Write a protein that binds this ligand. Sequence first.
Ligand SMILES: O=P(O)(O)O[C@H]1[C@@H](OP(=O)(O)O)[C@@H](OP(=O)(O)O)[C@@H](OP(=O)(O)O)[C@@H](OP(=O)(O)O)[C@H]1OP(=O)(O)O
Lengths: 225, 238, 228, 217, 502
Amino acid sequence: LFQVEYAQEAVKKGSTAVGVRGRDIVVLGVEKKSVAKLQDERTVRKICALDDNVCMAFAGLTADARIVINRARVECQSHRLTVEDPVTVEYITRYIASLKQRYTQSNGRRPFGISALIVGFDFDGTPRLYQTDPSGTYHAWKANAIGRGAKSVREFLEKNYTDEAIETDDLTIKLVIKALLEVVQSGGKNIELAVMRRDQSLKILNPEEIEKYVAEIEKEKEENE
Amino acid sequence: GFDRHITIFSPEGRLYQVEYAFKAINQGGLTSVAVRGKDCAVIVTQKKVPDKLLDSSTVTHLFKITENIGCVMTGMTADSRSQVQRARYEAANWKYKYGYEIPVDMLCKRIADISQVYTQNAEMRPLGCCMILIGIDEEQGPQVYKCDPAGYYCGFKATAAGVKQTESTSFLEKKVKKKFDWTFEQTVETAITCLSTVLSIDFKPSEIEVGVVTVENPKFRILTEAEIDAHLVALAER
Amino acid sequence: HAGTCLGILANDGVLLAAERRNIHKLLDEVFFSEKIYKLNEDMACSVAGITSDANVLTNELRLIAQRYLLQYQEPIPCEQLVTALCDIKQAYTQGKRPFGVSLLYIGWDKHYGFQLYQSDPSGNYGGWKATCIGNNSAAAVSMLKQDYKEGEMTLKSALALAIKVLNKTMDVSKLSAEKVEIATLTRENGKTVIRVLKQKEVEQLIKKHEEEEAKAEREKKEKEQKEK
Amino acid sequence: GKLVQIEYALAAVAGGAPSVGIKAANGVVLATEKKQKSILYDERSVHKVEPITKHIGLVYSGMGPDYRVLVHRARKLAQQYYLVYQEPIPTAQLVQRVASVMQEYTQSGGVRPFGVSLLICGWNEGRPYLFQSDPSGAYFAWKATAMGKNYVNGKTFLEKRYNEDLELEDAIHTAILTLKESFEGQMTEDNIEVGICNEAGFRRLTPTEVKDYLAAI
Amino acid sequence: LVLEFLRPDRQGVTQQQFKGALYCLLGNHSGVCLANLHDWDCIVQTWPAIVSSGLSQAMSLEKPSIVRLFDDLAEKIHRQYETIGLDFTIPKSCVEIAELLQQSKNPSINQILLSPEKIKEGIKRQQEKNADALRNYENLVDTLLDGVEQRNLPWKFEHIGIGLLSLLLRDDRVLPLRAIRFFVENLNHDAIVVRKMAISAVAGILKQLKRTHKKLTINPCEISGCPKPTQIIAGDRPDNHWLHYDSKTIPRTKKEWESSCFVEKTHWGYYTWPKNMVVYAGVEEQPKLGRSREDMTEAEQIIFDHFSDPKFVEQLITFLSLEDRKGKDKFNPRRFCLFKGIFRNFDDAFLPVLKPHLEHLVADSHESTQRCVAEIIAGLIRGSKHWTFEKVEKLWELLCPLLRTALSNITVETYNDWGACIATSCESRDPRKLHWLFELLLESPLSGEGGSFVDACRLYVLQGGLAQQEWRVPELLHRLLKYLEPKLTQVYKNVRERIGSV
Ligand SMILES: O=P(O)(O)O[C@H]1[C@@H](OP(=O)(O)O)[C@@H](OP(=O)(O)O)[C@@H](OP(=O)(O)O)[C@@H](OP(=O)(O)O)[C@H]1OP(=O)(O)O
């Protein structure tokens, strides 16, 4: 419980990330923090594909996130083996949450220190979004945010999320951009987008690919005035 | 404060628990003397009994690890018996594995390894007993070896363990400063004289227990009250 | 910070520069010569730590790589190797005895080409175009951020840059081939070549830096005179 | 902090008797004081110097029981290697493994670190070798060192007297000089333990030849 | 003698003797420094020798003990240095008291009175003493320069010598010309350590060069025209009304700007007016601005020329923009005080040269550029106070676009730095003088075009500025409250927090 507070503060410090649920699509956005002059941006992902049909975004300690991600990947494959079916997003969420409340081998920071957004498509095909907490409580959402400034984003998501917004899949993507744009002031390359696009594997957006979407909403922002 | 309560290094690097075990050996309250000769080695120690009812026979600080090896223990009695038991076990294990009787030095070495384990590990307190061993080695003849709780083991021309070990050792050093190659009777007289001087008791034969080994008779033997009295009376008329 | 290590990425290759130093005169230094440790044919590392810590870490790494080789009969990727070590050092964090050293890794992977990696003691790792570790790592990275051009590097220019930043950073007070250890990873005839620079080549590079410093000193004195 | 115990162990080492090592061109010497508390103590019985293998021997400054533990482990490790590879263990490899066990003990909780430093010498590949393995688990390679009491004083005396090229006899001499500095006095064959590593193999110098070397001074 | 052991020219000493002499120079933690003696004769011997010991040839910098020794010398000298002498002239009263003290005859022996010739000899000796001290100061400066640049020296010793030169900043007298040229030349130097050291040094130099500004005296009751009764109550008053900010009262013309008081310090006038007031006399009375470059003596001249150098300005700007650490960076008030001293001394000389660099810097989205340009912008604003109306008018015409783009491009990395910039610009200044900044910043903090977190950071820097203007802006606080009141119910959490703070 005391470690949980430190873990919750840690994820509060971490990079912002959001997820949205749409009828034939689910979108996941995480702000790409500046690294340095000389570092290479490849190694830092903040996004992971547990399976073909599941994607994840974490916020908090990177190493603990790595451990969690690996364990969940192997669990996803073992469940596919035993069950011959794609893993359910609720299931892998239950495992990742359940992994938090085993512990470290020493039991130090029994909560590993990440609250993560797990998004995927069910085998039947229904979209799903979930999150996890260091505590181990896990919920489902039409859309959510994590990390720094998530609360402010949730207010923006609360009003912006609508049947009209989700009616268009490309609009489903654009809403995520606006959410990040409120969170991050870079207004550009400092962002990472990933989309599942029902019945196909995760396709990370190109920097030009995100750029035109940003321009389109920037134009639509222009159009309102 | 957590340095004296367990076996860990002081700031100066000293193991206070081991010092305390050395104190416990004197807390036991008995003295033992060992001396080596050209043809023999001997052990002497007092076995003063407080209670009349308590059987004189059963109480003795001399034990037999093996037929050719005899030992004496000081300090805490229970720890002494445990150490004796383990020495017996190691000797038999040695014989079974290697086909020949363990030498006294190797036995002392093993026992010191065991005491080392306790002083190294915090869970176990150091075994508060000190063992002196006598045996005849074919190459080196008689031998005397002594293992402390700390794990230091060394051979001795003669030695003492007990509350008066210091004055005993001063006496033995004065004795061996002269060459004084001692036969059996001379070794016995030397040992009893050291103990009688250092304790100032002038023992009766029942008061003390004596064990020896000889090149002629390697078998470890405990001298009876009568032979002890013979040696003492030969001493007194001298 | 007993030791310092340095690493730079080039388009054609990678090099590690480490300060071969003797704390005391009596140290043989034949044993401590090998600042660079070859994990495998396609990777190397330099350690910011004592030789013992280095030996144990290097053994764990080599074991991992050889296990991957046993399974797949292909040389291990640099990221995967570094990641295995990072996972271990993390798990020590989760024991209460975290790995107390940071490592450079240099390698060539067919997937990503030439690469340079840094491992933090916390277990986190990152890819760097160029970086230093150990003593004066901060000054080292400052000079690198000054004097490095992304995409403009070649092995020769990078090597001279290494000599320069070493002259400023490391406390030799005079460059000597005995006092510095350089090694380069290069791809030749479709094979990974890890070659320690010979003492003669290092002396030549040192001399080039020395004469260049002299030529710079002439220019500054001239311009300063012209100002007044 | 666990490091505190390491520092205290190094202090316990520093309290230990003097031990000296010099690396000649053709041989390595290992020497130490074995000053006896009393004449009653028998010098022949116990040797601070002990061989791990035919070509390797070592000497300690610090706690003798810890030394007995470590020498036992080292002997078993060298024999393990010899069984696997049917060649003698390299000195560096042995030093590494011994460091591994020292580091293992100090790392383990509920047990104290070893209170000894070891000087490890050997001859292999037609070459001399010398190492010092500390309680922390660190090992270093030197041409010469001292340990125990006045170890810094011995080190500087070695630094002034050392030459890159010296014969085994001259290194024996300078070792004995180094100990003669620290020693209380009345140095003799019994009070001092010597061993050398060479092409012949490690051997503990008998009292007769040690008397010869002492008489040379 | 102790310096002889580590003398560079000497040979055959030893590594050991060198180390021992360094230990002697280091001394114990408490007691005689032995390298930082207050005596001018001792320091001239020691410090040059310390820096010159780099090329001694008896020094193994590889030695960790040796390098730690030199670092300990440096840290101990830096901490324990005190200002050293340069004047020992007793005033006339104290010698009168001493004359009485000799006269007291109860516990006294009747020593002969000090003769007038002796008293003349004493003042002669004291004058010679302080002159010799000044000589030693200049000689030590030249010598340490020679040490730091002799081309056989290691970098650590170079850094140490530059620090020692940093100590010699004097405040009685300007630094020697060669040394000033050395420091200003080192502003663009490869080592970051040396660069920061040079920055602090030259800012101190710029304060030394600063010409005194004449201050006239006003009556606060008179300028206000109020009665100013006795037993005044603190706070807003009739007399403080001219001090209070008002939109109508902004000058907006050269004549009114000349007319305005511009007290330039907030705290005056809340509780009670002082006995004598000082209001920064008219620009004609103040030192000249727009100097010909013939006026400057020699020390201002070298700084002027280096900064006129565009290659120099570019190299320095690029070095400042370089990141030292990621996420741990801050406003760097020493860099700020440097830039303020520059602009204040030289009166808008180099804003033309810097304008390309500023226009480039604000355009960059990187954090460190924004940090540097913020420090520069606020240093410029603070230097602007003594500038004339036309100069400041041109300056604000320059600044307003830069600031608009900066605030539009504020971000998570840069918000703290830009708030520090706005606060430091706003601090210790009359509000009417800085009306441009307020009119700009308050134009639309809750714009929402940029979105949330940027509306918040705008409100944050705003709050910083208004905090700096305590009790002199009842107007514009009423305006902020009016603008703010509608938006209470249309807002997200971060903005709500900053709204509460403001
Ligand atoms: O009266 P001075 O000693 O000459 O100093 C004042 C004053 O400093 P004081 O408050 O100590 O009098 C100001 O405020 P500070 O910031 O120095 O506290 C000002 O500085 P700002 O421009 O930052 O308000 C500036 O001091 P400086 O000359 O050190 O920059 C100014 O000096 P002038 O009156 O000579 O202009």
